[PDB]
């Protein structure tokens, strides 16, 4: 599932799995891609947040406050929930229908939202990340990022 993944995205997921541990969490959940996707930090996904009046440290405190944390644990294999699976099945389904040949950050975030049932989809939502108000701004970051491009 990661074959098309860009470096960047898979660093992602590998952050997910840290969050998890970071928090005590016994599963990774989609808050978990959520907190890994604003830990990265430097994305198209997160710059798509930021340029829509969303912070990044914003997101952090509502979904903390959510997901609270688990008992000191040892580490090792933490499994992804279905909806955590699910997430990254719509980032390629993302990326197919805008004519990406790559799993991006902003293909994560837009699967995020889509899932619509968890906590990531919850708190984004409520703070105004309505589904195609991203996808367009991801959209819009991409071509403004192309014209600079042909400018130098």
């Given at each position: 599932m990661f074959e098309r993944f860009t470096d960047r995205a898979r660093r992602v997921v590998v952050l997910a799995q840290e969050e998890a541990r970071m928090?005590?969490?016994?599963y990774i959940g989609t808050e978990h891609i959520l907190l890994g996707l604003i830990h990265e930090g430097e994305g198209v996904a997160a710059k798509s947040l930021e340029s829509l009046g969303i912070s990044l440290e914003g997101v952090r405190s509502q979904v903390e406050e959510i997901i609270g944390q688990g008992q000191?644990?040892?580490?090792?294999?933490?499994p992804?929930?279905?909806?955590?699976k699910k997430?990254?099945?719509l980032s390629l389904r993302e990326a197919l229908q805008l004519g990406?040949?790559?799993?991006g950050t902003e293909h994560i975030l837009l699967g995020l939202i889509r899932e619509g049932e968890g906590v990531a989809a919850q708190v984004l939502v409520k703070l105004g990340a309505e589904l195609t108000r991203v996808?367009?701004?991801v959209i819009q970051l991409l071509s403004?990022?192309?014209l600079?491009?042909?400018l130098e």
């Open positions: 928090l005590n969490h016994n000191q644990a040892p580490s090792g294999h933490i992804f929930t279905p909806r955590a997430v990254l099945e990406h040949n790559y799993i996808r367009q701004q403004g990022y192309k600079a491009a042909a």
